[PDB]
RNA sequence: CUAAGAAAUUCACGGCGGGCUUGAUGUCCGCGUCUACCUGAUUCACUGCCGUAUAGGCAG
């Protein structure tokens, strides 16, 4: 919704047990809503004190590993679980299945404000780093890189370069920093285009079928495979309203009594994993919140991509 | 009236990482940054029926017929190499601040009263005893569990990491420090002071804990076993699956946390077990029995409700237990 | 203010019995690899002498 004055590269963050249950219909990498909420929590905890704004996150996923196993004779997968403590009567409690995964990500935070000129870039980058070093990203702790060969320092780069050549070189070197990874972007326009193509293929087709078709492996007879432009994962695109907006005190057992509570339900959209060299500017990968509370549509997305 | 909060939650303070397992030789523990990792392998086991019979399978003909069918299983096994006798277990520990602050809570008066209760506790005696017991659980190799059982000598090295380097280093003999007695030692008091300062701070204090256990040359080590539900599939599965992060056997983070939480020696039952993990309703998974039952007035919920609502302050040991539960975390609150 | 907040999978195990893989076989005709270059830039920081000297000078 806004152009950042600088990009804050949080370095390789080792996330221990992230919520691999991204949505009621998808598993694997955590939802972009988790990353946007983590960036908003960074702004709420240290961004205000630095007189800056932290909006926009770039997700690169240098390494992924989910605690999953494949049972013998089945082609699907199951989630490895944890042994919860016993009940008060000494019996095993009912198991609630949750997926927990290991990440290694580096985040590009969009920074705009007066604290960029008020404070040195290295100082605010550092203070954001040790602020994030005691937080959670997707339900998992953050490993702070102690006593390895060398830690990766935080680096903030102002987008207003002295020249176009200097800006282009800075963008390419920042891309070289987060090279063993794949940027995560959203493909709502591609999903709608494929849905229109599917509707011309056969009518009364919903966007759920278009989203399923763009992710499944399709086999066509002469036996070939329908190729995909990219990786094309299905991701939760936000939340849609399910109930009228209640007052902060109406809902029993709320998180607090100062915030209105509205029941919602997941919105499923299209996403893409792509190498960071295939983006014009690294600020095009930033994920933003788009609430629009009048009609629900509590959405997160990455605009200005193409 | 100070009604208790409908939604109550506490963040997990004192959270460790996965205990990476690696192997090497004793008297080379200093140059152990390049020690090769312990790998989880596969092997086949053929056993025989040895469980109790249900008075109908005790016929000799049926027993012999069932023995004549071979019992084959595939298990995950982790071993030290045939030229290495020392198992090195390394993990990272973050001691988070804001220890008494709830993560989610409804009632604002309950917020003020609970924060007042924690303030009274911290300016009365603080985390002196709790961090002492946590530093003891760090100093002895309780997080090795079955790896600590038959080791010739165990040494635990704990380093404080401030920016990127060792601000302060510790070295302990884990077998000398008991698993049930919490004495006082100068280095242990320094570690307890650091942990208490981390708990009372606003940021976090980072510790790496490296334990060397002289298991034996080529012996069998015990990483954490993974919980996988069979879910009634027709194919036979592997009976034992071990945990590994990147081709390297590891121990689960919650397993290490349960090892560190074993500080509760104030439960109403006798301390024949010794310390137990700090949990609501005092549950012990190995003993199958939950001490601190709610029929007695020593469970966490009733103690907290009497302490914060009716201002019935419990004993100092029960206050330590309640604050240790606050360190542990959990999702609380009635409907 | 992160489908937020919380969690011990674990004890025990004999996989082995035995075995002939052998029979036969044409790889093969033909072929233009050329042209043109500064290794050397202070590239030998070397040998001896006065002085206890590693402190510091001197000789061709």
TrEMBL record, chain A:
A Pfam family reported for this protein in Swiss-Prot or TrEMBL: Cas_Csy2
InterPro entries: CRISPR-assoc_prot_Csy2 (IPR013398)
CDD domains hit by this protein: Csy2_I-F (cd09736)
Name of protein: Uncharacterized protein
Organism: Pseudomonas aeruginosa
